[PDB]
Amino acid sequence: FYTAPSTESKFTEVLSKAKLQYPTSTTVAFADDLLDGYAASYFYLTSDLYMQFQVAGSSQRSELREMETSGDEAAWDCTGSTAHVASAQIAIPVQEDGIEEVTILQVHDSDVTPVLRISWVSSITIDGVTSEDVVLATIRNGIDDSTATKTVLQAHTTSRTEFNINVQNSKLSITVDGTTELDEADISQFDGSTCYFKAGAYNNNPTDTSANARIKMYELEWVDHH
Ligand SMILES: O=C(O)[C@H]1O[C@@H](O[C@H]2[C@H](O)[C@H](O)[C@H](O[C@H]3[C@H](O)[C@H](O)[C@H](O)O[C@@H]3C(=O)O)O[C@@H]2C(=O)O)[C@@H](O)[C@@H](O)[C@@H]1O
Ligand SMILES: O=C(O)C1=C[C@H](O)[C@H](O)[C@H](O[C@H]2[C@H](O)[C@H](O)[C@H](O[C@H]3[C@H](O)[C@H](O)[C@H](O)O[C@@H]3C(=O)O)O[C@@H]2C(=O)O)O1
């Protein structure tokens, strides 16, 4: 008894350019499956027309992974001259007790390193400054450096919020409700890597492994420009 996101034409293009991974990195639904009305407790259309992702457990995910319409996985030059843009309108509900960080958008390399995660966090301390209940950008410093540069982007609201990620040349920018919150951060450490976007709910370090992380997207798209 779940309505499919494919019933809304605003999602046709991104679904055609995606596969759905749940609850780990295994694909549960390819583009053709998603367009044919795929729906489940972890991925469905709400009555007010949000695409909702929900998942429980440590490092579990309900997430779309960027694909080409050809069926090739997206694997664009992370630092190339072609711009790659992801845009989403996201409503982040108050998270259930025990949910401590939920990744909602990513730029990931074609191996094992996230270039960028945008996530909601219960708390973060950056250079001695603790912020609570915020949306955060985390950029890994390198493939062989587990550390990352972290930037608070927004105080958490439940209101629908526009996120834009713009990747071009060796630089990455993030706008939140039209305001630049990360301005051409350097990602040259991913020269020679290929990349793709992800969107959904990726549950990071929960304290209750049975609680559900839950993220709602009113719009979502990913595009190139040449
Ligand atoms: O408060 C800190 O900044 C803290 O960060 C620690 O390394 C983090 C790293 O910053 C990053 O957030 C990473 O994120 C993971 C993510 O949790 C998830 O597993 C994803 O799939 O992979 C990401 C990744 O590895 O890039 O998690 C690291 C972590 O150890 O939790 C340390 O640098 C720590 O000393 C520091 O205080
Ligand atoms: O999402 C992250 O931030 C992230 C960081 C962790 O350290 C892992 O690297 C984890 O990487 C995932 C990645 O997000 C993809 O889901 C990837 O999927 C590939 C796998 O080979 C799958 O088997 C799938 O069939 O093809 C996927 C693809 O490239 O699209 O898997 C890794 C991972 O779990 O190691 O995420």
Q: DSSP H helical segments within 83-225, as ranges?
A: none
State in Å: Cα 146 to ligand 1 middle.
Answer: 7
| 25 within ligand 2 shell (Cβ under 6 A) | yes
- Residues touching ligand 1 (Cβ under 6 Å) are 59, 114, 125, 138, 140, 146-148, 150, 204
- Cα–Cα distance, 80 to 67 (Å, whole number): 18
Residue-by-residue DSSP string for 16-69: HTEEEE-SSSSEEE-HHHHHTT--BTTEEE-TTS-EEEEEESTT-EEEEEEB-T
Residue of 58, 122, 147 lying closest to 136 (CA atoms): 122
Q: Which of 30, 55, 63, 108 to mutate to test the pocket of ligand 2 (most atoms within 8 A of CB)?
A: 108
Report the nearest-CA residue for atom 21 of ligand 2: 25
Q: How far is CA 22 from the centre of its chain?
A: 14
Q: Classify residue 121 as exposed, middle or buried by CB count within 10 Å of its CB (0-12, 13-18, 19+).
A: buried
Q: What is the largest CA-CA distance in the chain?
A: 49
- Cα–Cα distance, 88 to 10 (Å, whole number): 12
Instruction: Let me know: does 43 contact 212? Beta carbons within 8 Å.
Output: no
- Cα–Cα distance, 111 to 166 (Å, whole number): 21
Contacts (Cβ under 8 Å, ≥6 apart) of 211: 56, 95, 96, 97, 98, 99
- Cα–Cα distance, 212 to 217 (Å, whole number): 16
- Cα–Cα distance, 210 to 206 (Å, whole number): 9
Residues in the chain: 226
Q: In angstroms, what is the resolution?
A: 1.5
| 21 within ligand 2 shell (Cβ under 6 A) | yes
CA 196, 180, 201, 224 dihedral sign is negative
| 214 within ligand 2 shell (Cβ under 6 A) | no
Q: What is the distance between the terminal CA atoms of the chain, rounded to a whole angstrom?
A: 42
Q: Which of 103, 107, 121, 147 to mutate to test the pocket of ligand 1 (most atoms within 8 A of CB)?
A: 147
What was the elucidation method?
X-ray
- Cα–Cα distance, 74 to 51 (Å, whole number): 22
Output the six-digit token pair for 174. Answer: 């993030």
Q: Which residue has the tokens 């793709």?
A: 196
Output the six-digit token pair for 59. Answer: 């490092």
- Cα–Cα distance, 15 to 62 (Å, whole number): 14
